[PDB]
Design a protein around this nucleic acid. Sequence first.
RNA 1: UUUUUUUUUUUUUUUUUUUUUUUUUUCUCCUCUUUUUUUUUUUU
Length: 241
Amino acid sequence: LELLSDQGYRVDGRRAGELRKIQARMGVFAQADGSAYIEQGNTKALAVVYGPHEIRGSRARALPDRALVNCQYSSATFSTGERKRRPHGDRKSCEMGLQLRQTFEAAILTQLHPRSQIDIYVQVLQADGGTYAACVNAATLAVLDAGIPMRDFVCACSAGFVDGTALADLSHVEEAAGGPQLALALLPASGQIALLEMDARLHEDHLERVLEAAAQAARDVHTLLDRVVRQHVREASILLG
RNA sequence: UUUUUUUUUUUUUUUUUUUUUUUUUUCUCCUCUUUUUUUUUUUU
């Protein structure tokens, strides 16, 4: 099957260094302390956060120096072509909630809420392509909506490598083809990387170009989400006064 | 030849948990030429 034509067009019609269309939203729910909604291409995510509160259970599991970040991951049973129902014991959810907890224990400026918990929930309504970056961006928007201070605006994007060229924002068809996939979590102002992942084989000479293309695609996600945040804050500033 | 007074480092600790590798596709596809097919035999 052709994943890159001779003309340079992909299966869905975009070039190598081209992203899908994103359409976000802030303030979806009312009861919670924060909310967000993003649809990156054909993947629909959702995130809900709860502000610093009293530790549930009160089983002396607190930290006297910082706060306790608690991230979960879930997925709807109609999120793909087949039903594929799973119980709440899978290790895919555990590893996704652990990479989420790892990146948000580094992005959030947590040394201001001693002996407090932060509960972050992510719900995926339709998965087609990169799920990690869609969850990270939806929870970055939900955290901004909740007013929790943070060092920067963390954004994530993936990449690939086919026929000696570097792709960007891979889809499920391209992902399920046995290629060197790769994902980041970038802080645009400093250029630092919060998380790095990889699978499948790849030569050592092509790591610089796949990593550079992924970082550039994350910097391209940054501008599009930045205009959404600026329009939202100008909206509320106009409403307030 | 210049008296008298203006307190200070948050209180708390004797919390239960009965799971388990993975996980999810890619179609049908013209094999060229001396033949029947030789064959016992012996030295390993």
